[PDB]
Scaffold this active site. Structure first.
Site, mmCIF file in Angstrom:
data_model
loop_
_atom_site.group_PDB
_atom_site.id
_atom_site.type_symbol
_atom_site.label_atom_id
_atom_site.label_comp_id
_atom_site.label_asym_id
_atom_site.label_seq_id
_atom_site.Cartn_x
_atom_site.Cartn_y
_atom_site.Cartn_z
ATOM 1 N N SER A 14 0.775 -1.231 0.000
ATOM 2 C CA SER A 14 0.000 0.000 0.000
ATOM 3 C C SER A 14 0.816 1.296 0.000
ATOM 4 C CB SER A 14 -0.968 -0.011 1.200
ATOM 5 O OG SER A 14 -1.538 1.276 1.389
ATOM 6 N N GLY A 15 0.488 2.181 -0.939
ATOM 7 C CA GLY A 15 1.157 3.466 -1.050
ATOM 8 C C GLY A 15 0.853 4.321 0.164
ATOM 9 N N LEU A 16 -0.386 4.250 0.633
ATOM 10 C CA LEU A 16 -0.788 4.992 1.819
ATOM 11 C C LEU A 16 -0.066 4.461 3.074
ATOM 12 C CD1 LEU A 16 -2.493 6.880 3.533
ATOM 13 C CD2 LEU A 16 -4.183 5.022 3.695
ATOM 14 N N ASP A 37 0.980 10.742 1.373
ATOM 15 C CA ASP A 37 0.908 9.850 0.221
ATOM 16 C C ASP A 37 0.857 10.682 -1.064
ATOM 17 O OD1 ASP A 37 0.605 7.695 -1.447
ATOM 18 O OD2 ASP A 37 -1.414 7.152 -0.765
ATOM 19 N N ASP A 41 1.923 -0.598 -4.929
ATOM 20 C CA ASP A 41 1.118 0.500 -5.465
ATOM 21 C C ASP A 41 2.202 1.490 -5.829
ATOM 22 O OD1 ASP A 41 -0.302 2.940 -5.865
ATOM 23 O OD2 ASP A 41 -1.820 2.353 -4.411
ATOM 24 N N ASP A 53 1.905 4.304 -7.612
ATOM 25 C CA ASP A 53 1.351 5.587 -8.066
ATOM 26 C C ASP A 53 1.296 5.638 -9.590
ATOM 27 O OD1 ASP A 53 1.241 6.417 -5.381
ATOM 28 O OD2 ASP A 53 3.304 7.137 -5.470
ATOM 29 N N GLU A 64 -1.402 3.974 -11.824
ATOM 30 C CA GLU A 64 -2.703 4.665 -11.978
ATOM 31 C C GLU A 64 -2.647 5.763 -13.026
ATOM 32 O OE1 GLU A 64 -3.164 5.998 -7.945
ATOM 33 O OE2 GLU A 64 -1.849 7.724 -8.326
ATOM 34 N N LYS A 123 0.491 17.192 -8.970
ATOM 35 C CA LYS A 123 -0.562 18.190 -8.862
ATOM 36 C C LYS A 123 -0.019 19.501 -9.443
ATOM 37 C CE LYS A 123 -4.491 18.620 -6.024
ATOM 38 N NZ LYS A 123 -5.353 17.593 -5.366
ATOM 39 N N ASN A 127 -2.462 22.396 -10.145
ATOM 40 C CA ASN A 127 -3.360 23.498 -9.774
ATOM 41 C C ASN A 127 -4.214 23.090 -8.565
ATOM 42 O OD1 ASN A 127 -6.227 22.536 -10.690
ATOM 43 N ND2 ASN A 127 -4.852 22.029 -12.400
ATOM 44 N N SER A 128 -4.679 24.071 -7.798
ATOM 45 C CA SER A 128 -5.464 23.795 -6.594
ATOM 46 C C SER A 128 -6.942 24.162 -6.686
ATOM 47 C CB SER A 128 -4.845 24.522 -5.394
ATOM 48 O OG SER A 128 -4.795 25.925 -5.606
ATOM 49 N N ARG A 163 -4.511 0.739 -12.750
ATOM 50 C CA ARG A 163 -5.594 1.273 -11.879
ATOM 51 C C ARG A 163 -6.347 2.482 -12.668
ATOM 52 N NH1 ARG A 163 -7.513 2.502 -6.735
ATOM 53 N NH2 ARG A 163 -7.415 4.691 -6.017
ATOM 54 N N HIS A 182 -11.626 1.206 -9.162
ATOM 55 C CA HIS A 182 -11.980 1.778 -7.876
ATOM 56 C C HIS A 182 -13.102 2.797 -7.958
ATOM 57 C CE1 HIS A 182 -10.394 3.183 -3.706
ATOM 58 N NE2 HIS A 182 -11.262 2.192 -3.607
#
Lengths: 291, 291, 291, 291
Positions: free
Chosen positions: C42-44, C54, C81, C83, C110, C116, C118-119, C155, C186
């Site tokens: 698990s990546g988390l 993560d 995982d 990513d 995945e 990331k 932009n927010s 994924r 998922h």
């Protein structure tokens, strides 16, 4: 002593043209220091090349940081690392900066290229670069994250390199400088200094400028002084010299099946011990080990 | 293809005198391969020196393994690593061997010196070495632990180096060879081959012997063939050549504040790209990225 | 039977398979002793145990190192995982090669944009990586494997990102056609409706993996009725571990004593057993002089 | 107030202090949130989480890396169990310097011979490192610190190794005279008798640290009556974590469902909180273009 970060910061802001020399491992870092250079350039090309990989973020950022940790451990002058785009967004970039700061690295140079490469269009038009506000914000995050206020952030503008012009270059440089960059690294792909000259004329000395004269190396150094350039980076010459020597030495021994024709052309084993500071350990052993 | 381990094993057991060349990073490993050498020597002195540290187990064994991982990734010929005493007892030694095996390294050379240095008595008498049964058992554990039956274990006998004589050297060599060592590395501190000759005469070819002629380099190579030596290691000449080139190049640029006097004396940037195999990536990018 | 093959057989089996999350060497060994035929890296869980977020804060080599200890401590396959592969196709395939070398059995990639940029958190659907780009990354990974049985699970983030069934179907078919060994589908729902819809539309074109964390009250036989190939219990060991540590730490903090925890935790002897300490005791008896 | 100073003040305080074991970034954060003023970086716990034995199987740099994540995740000081320093005085001081650079507050070094050299388990008392040798290692570490407040705790193995009070006293005074910030006195008994005997004979020459794991039913006020400076709760978080993971894994294995564990473990939301995920959400809002 003066902190390494402070040493680099003073160099970027000095009234004299300063020079930093490329090093790619602990051994070359010490040699650069012993020569008298006030600073070292942690070349992205050299570090990746010595590892045997390409200069496209194949080595992880922590593997790069470890190479620089050995370099920092082996030198007293500041090292400015070519950190590409920061290995991700603002968050990866500020995390990198904090780790570099903790290992003694003096500054980091970040560039506004898109990362990673997502398309393969090979036409003859200009190449899209990172959004200006996004990169400026990245620079801001790094500055905001520093625990040492003298750690330096140098912003490398890729406008010329990507095919755009002076106007794009100036806009980006001003934006990054306004975001807190300690210096702007202006590069070009030309075999002459024309892009550098056009930029320095339009820049009106809004901040320190760093240049890399690898391709326009016959330009008189005083010309950079006349333009008010703050620092010159000798980007990859120790790596290039090392390769010439290793290729030559290896072929000679391969051909001769003997060491007779290389022994008098290379440094002695004792010089290697001296560069490793073996004497300091010998002394420590006599002081800390029971007789 | 032939496994790297198998390639090294064949070299140690061949009827011809074989040669392996020192490399200390991924870049030098590729250069050694391109030159035609059938094998590479991962010098303990060179790896530590390039990192800027001393050859006294200052770098951790995993840091050493990472340097060798990049070296193995950059070469098709076997690499024999100088692993000092195995970084601990039999357990640390077999753990090291398994990690090396997994990274593609072909063999490891272990020596029978005491580790670490606990005393500082600097008299003129012979130096105590690891207990013979303990070292033989260490060799046995490594052999027993291998997942690749062709991975090689070379035992370096320090009897001569430590001040003892032929009798001690022979006893140790026979013991290690009986424990499963694939070859014996016989070294000495003399600037002539006398210790090597005395050993080869008494050894009666009980197994492959590896020598390092660094200090008695004017000895005719055919003399080693006449003695039945199996392999010669050119121990540290690329490192020594690299240092000469870097010191020279750095001083020149430092003195000239220009690149004019080094540009024609070093390889071009494109040669660095070629050594990094940049073309292979360019092609991969055109095949795996959308146009 | 290699770990890679074991995992491949599970993905392609006619029965619903199960893999349990683990996040370090110790928990991987515990999952194995329990009887699980596979482990979910698990990546988390991996990022959380390290204390970071993560979002690719730890470098891919630091993640690979955690997984190395996990693989060393288990005999059953681990699906990592990964990513988005930590970059473009080239970073992804380098990662796959290092994972293969470490004994890891497969990697789950995945199709999200990375990183990331932009927010904006309005209400619109979040754009994902280009379908052709991700399909080619999968292909590059498949083409790069040295072990034919290593598994690449794709994924699909369509439902998560707010798009519909048509997008999820479209993505899955492309990744499957590119060579993915399985599709991980998922959802953000507390019910299995997106999965039901996908399985109906999928027409068993390939193995499907799901994570029922959020719709955990859905009977497992229902998944078997839908033809689901594998279920991932994604993060319960990490969650159980946090509950235990928080409770134990609080008890000791409040009591300034061990009296109220000693009987609720495993004995020190169980830790030694899990570490295989007796195995080393036996090796020391064999490889260390008896005296 | 630096972490080093915090730990130094605790060792020298007039009150009995307490430090809780942690073995990764996550557990270090949990120990901190509980209110503990210090963390014990257990050698047994760190090696166990990695899945290896507590006999220097993981390299010192791999251990330092685990501790780096732990230090990054906590604001209170961490005292690392550094075995014997991973070598002689030089390896020890290099370790201390890297720990200092990472934010670790102190290192506990023990006077055992390293590594294991023979497997004789008769009945005799086990020989320890030479007293002068270990005293000098402590001194070399103290002399090497860049931070005056970094702490070196000397763990005396006399009682454990089967020797008596006279040996323990003799060792402790030497290590204390060499500069140790505190003495960790341990025993193999299920009662505090060796500690009582030592404290009586010690005459408060310096701070004493103890580990009551085996004599846990002894009232804590008794330690305060003896003038003990610090108590180490050595491995309960690791032990609690194993109990939880084994129970949770078994429940899921047997039920092929999450129904019987979901209500007994922390929610996924608590994991995000522990990871400080909201902090990154806030940073993204500030440093990423709003659109």
């Amino acid at each position: 002593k003066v902190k390494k970060t402070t040493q680099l910061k003073q160099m970027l802001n000095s009234k004299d043209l300063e020079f930093i020399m490329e090093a790619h491992n602990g051994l070359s870092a010490r040699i650069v220091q012993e020569a008298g250079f006030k600073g070292i350039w942690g070349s992205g090309l050299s570090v990746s090349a010595q590892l045997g990989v390409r200069d496209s973020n194949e080595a992880s950022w922590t593997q790069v940081v470890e190479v620089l940790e050995f370099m920092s451990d082996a030198s007293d002058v500041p090292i400015l690392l070519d950190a590409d785009t920061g290995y991700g967004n603002f968050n990866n970039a500020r995390r990198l900066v904090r780790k570099l700061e903790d290992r003694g690295v003096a500054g980091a140079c970040l560039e506004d290229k898109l990362f990673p490469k997502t398309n393969s269009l090979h036409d003859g038009r200009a190449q899209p670069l990172a959004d200006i506000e996004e990169f400026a914000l990245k620079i801001k995050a790094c500055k905001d994250s520093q625990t040492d206020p003298d750690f330096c952030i140098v912003a490398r503008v890729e406008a010329f390199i990507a095919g755009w012009g002076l106007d794009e270059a100036l806009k980006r440089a001003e934006a990054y400088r306004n975001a807190g960059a300690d210096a702007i690294l202006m590069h070009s792909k030309k075999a002459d200094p024309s892009d550098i000259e056009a930029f320095m004329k339009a820049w009106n000395n809004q901040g320190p400028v760093v240049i890399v004269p690898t391709k326009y190396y016959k330009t008189p150094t005083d010309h950079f002084r006349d333009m008010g350039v703050s620092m010159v980076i000798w980007a990859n010459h120790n790596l290039r010299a090392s390769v010439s020597a290793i290729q030559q030495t290896t072929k000679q021994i391969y051909d001769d099946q003997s060491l007779v024709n290389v022994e008098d052309k290379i440094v002695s084993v004792k010089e290697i011990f001296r560069l490793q500071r073996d004497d300091e350990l010998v002394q420590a052993e006599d002081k800390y080990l029971p007789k």
